[PDB]
Amino acid sequence: MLKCYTCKEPMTSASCRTITRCKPEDTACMTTLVTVEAEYPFNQSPVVTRSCSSSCVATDPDSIGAAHLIFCCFRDLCNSEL
Numbered sequence: 001m002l003k004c005y006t007c008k009e010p011m012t013s014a015s016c017r018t019i020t021r022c023k024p025e026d027t028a029c030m031t032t033l034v035t036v037e038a039e040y041p042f043n044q045s046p047v048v049t050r051s052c053s054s055s056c057v058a059t060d061p062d063s064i065g066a067a068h069l070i071f072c073c074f075r076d077l078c079n080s081e082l
Contacts, residue, residue, distance in 0.1 A: 004029035022052035033069035
C-alpha cells in the first residue's frame with residue numbers, strides 16, 4: 001500500500017517524519033511546507049503537514065490564496081526529509 005512520512009502531531013511537531021500507511025482510496029502523497037516568517041528573517045518552528053492524497057496536484061507560485069508549497073508524489077516515502 002501507499003506509505004507516506006506522515007506525522008501523528010500537527011504542524012506543532014518538529015520533525016514531521018513518520019512511516020504511515022495511506023488509505024486504499026488514495027493513490028499519491030501530499031506535503032505542506034510554509035515557514036513561520038517568510039517576509040522577515042526569523043528562525044522558528046515552521047508549519048508543515050504531510051498527508052496522503054488521491055490526486056497529486058500543485059498550485060501556482062503566486063501563493064496569493066493560501067497556496068503554500070504543496071508537494072506530492074506517487075511513491076512510498078518518495079521524500080524522507082521534511
